[PDB]
Design a protein around this nucleic acid. Sequence first.
DNA 1: TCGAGAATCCCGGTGCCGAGGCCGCTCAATTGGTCGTAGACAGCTCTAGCACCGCTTAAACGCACGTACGCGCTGTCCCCCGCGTTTTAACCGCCAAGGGGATTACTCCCTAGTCTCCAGGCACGTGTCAGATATATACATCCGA
DNA 2: TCGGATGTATATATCTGACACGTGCCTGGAGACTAGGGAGTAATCCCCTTGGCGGTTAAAACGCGGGGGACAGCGCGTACGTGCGTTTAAGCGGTGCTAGAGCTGTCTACGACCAATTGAGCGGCCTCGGCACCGGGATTCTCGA
Lengths: 351, 97, 82
Amino acid sequence: NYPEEADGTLDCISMALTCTFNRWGTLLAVGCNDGRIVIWDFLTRGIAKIISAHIHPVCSLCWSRDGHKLVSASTDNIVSQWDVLSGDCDQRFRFPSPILKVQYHPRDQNKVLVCPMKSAPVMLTLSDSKHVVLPVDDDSDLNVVASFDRRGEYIYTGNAKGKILVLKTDSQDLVASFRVTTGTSNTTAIKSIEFARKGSCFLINTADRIIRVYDGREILTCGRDGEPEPMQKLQDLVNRTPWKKCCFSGDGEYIVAGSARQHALYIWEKSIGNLVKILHGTRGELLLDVAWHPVRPIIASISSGVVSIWAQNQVENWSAFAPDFKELDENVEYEERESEFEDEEVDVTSV
Amino acid sequence: PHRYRPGTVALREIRRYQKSTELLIRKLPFQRLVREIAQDFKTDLRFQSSAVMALQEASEAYLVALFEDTNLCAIHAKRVTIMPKDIQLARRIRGER
Amino acid sequence: KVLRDNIQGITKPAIRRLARRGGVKRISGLIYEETRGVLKVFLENVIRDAVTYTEHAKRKTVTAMDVVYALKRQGRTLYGFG
DNA sequence: TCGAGAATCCCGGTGCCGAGGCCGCTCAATTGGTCGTAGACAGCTCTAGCACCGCTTAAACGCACGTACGCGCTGTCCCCCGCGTTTTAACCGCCAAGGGGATTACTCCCTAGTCTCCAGGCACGTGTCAGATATATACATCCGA
DNA sequence: TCGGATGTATATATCTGACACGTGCCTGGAGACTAGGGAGTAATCCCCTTGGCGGTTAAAACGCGGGGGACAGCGCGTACGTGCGTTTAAGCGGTGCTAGAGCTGTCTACGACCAATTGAGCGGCCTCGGCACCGGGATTCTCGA
């Protein structure tokens, strides 16, 4: 459940940059400094497939709605739809050469949203080379992180000034917009926008090293220009601990976040959100990437090619090996007795 | 590679801070603290700036007197370093608590 | 517009400079949250009394004279504000 | 881990002086009335407190690092405690004696209160030099060999 | 002990905006007059403070032995200063604006004040029982084995 101890690693491929699990969590693609298409198996802990693609560090990767098509983003604006059968290029044209995010629509692998570094997020079709630019109010930030929701309804576009702007995936409907300040001095640079797997409880990373949990249902309840309070504020207590990456569990129940300083990582929940365990590590290691598995407590931790994995909370006991053995906790004195001395044709292939 | 021995810079700090007379706390965080703990007894209050200055003066003088008596206690216990039990002893003997 | 913090806004080196004006050579590490607690416990009483004067006077702003009278009741009298 | 034994802790009989209660009575608190005014309240103005914004840099913050001291340990030594024996004055009951402090009656002169008058203090409008601030520069001191 | 490396007073030049100084003018202080009531002052008495005399004993004073606290030297490894380089939010300007403090005008309900009774609280006098006090026996913590 919550993974605890060392568990080793699979450091078979160096220079690792990013990592992504498929729709079922069961595959893995790692673009590296050269940006190859490297695939693994998980129960074997073995390599499935290696395909060389380019020379550049391929930053953004995403699977498909069936878990069978892919997408890439190197330094040279190479934004094609890719495949898991052959993996071949389809589209390539000009973008600004730092590229942050591409993102399929979660109900259509035609609609894709390209987010450059210092440009507006641009929504592309994958039927052809069409592109739709979403509106920006500020045009002074030029840093408006955007994302589809889990379903496919809206796009949540938030600037570097803490201002929320919600757009509809085809008609840019501002059904909700707000701004957040806490311990009120000023607003905060929005670090990231997140989404869970079960429902709409989500969170926002902010540059005050404080993580605030939200829910789109009450956001739509207030609609535009309400005051949505956070469900839960998450932060570090003793120190600053600036953050590089945060993630949910495989349903959005645990929330484990990766620091950018120490290689010693912190685990929370959603409902309680308690710091249940500090997963430590070597101090002389730079954490670079974190990934989580849905039905297994996998922590894919890229630290400069070193991809180390901590996966536990399964502690073996008896009464499964020997069910006669009844493991008492303390001394159980008792007497078990108050006096110490049909032809159902059951289907065997019922699928 | 020139480094002083420990304590000398502390002594010249003591000299020049006992020489000078000014405020020692930035005014905006103290002001926000005052408004914060003022919020609870009544909402929507306003402040002349002179009142905030007066609060800053009185609190700073009180803390300085507390540190002087604490330092006397720590010297009596044959140490150089100050401990929170010495602070507790000073507030015990003074009769505030 | 709701404030909820800046008790931590009192920095660490400010308390160091107050100790230096106090005549202190060597400080432990455990002193700081003790000192913040002592400071807040001090301020609460004066704020209660100044609010009580203002509420009796039927106004909304807080003047300096109210602070002066609230200090005057404590035995700690301040000169220089009227 | 044990018995001897020296303070303690209920239990019971005696008696006694101080709460408690009762009574008898003067003074003050209540009723009923008027009347002059502090303040209750409405209305107008205008000024500081708040809000926002842009630019800067002083100031906070993290991090090694190297060192010095707060605490523990161990030996010492002597002086403050527990006890016995002897003096002495605190105490208690008692006696006498006399100064001073409540006490009332009786003038009286000293301050509240009124009215008239008129100038010392106060808001306002000036100028201008004491000190802030910048700049070079002897020199006093501290750590290391 | 000397030698360099410093932070530190020390001399000088320039602006400037608080401080010192004239100005009109008024509202509050001075000058006379009047009462009536607070307070000064002369008896006075009786009580409560001072002073003294024997008894007795319980407590203070004085030795004595000793063993447990004060205390001083050593040893460590721990926590906290010093210096440097890297972020950020205090601070300093400019603008708006507006609730709210502050001054003015009007009246009226509400406390000051003056006889008048009456009952309610205050001084005086019993008394009888809760507690003082003493004997006596059960209990129990301490300290050498």
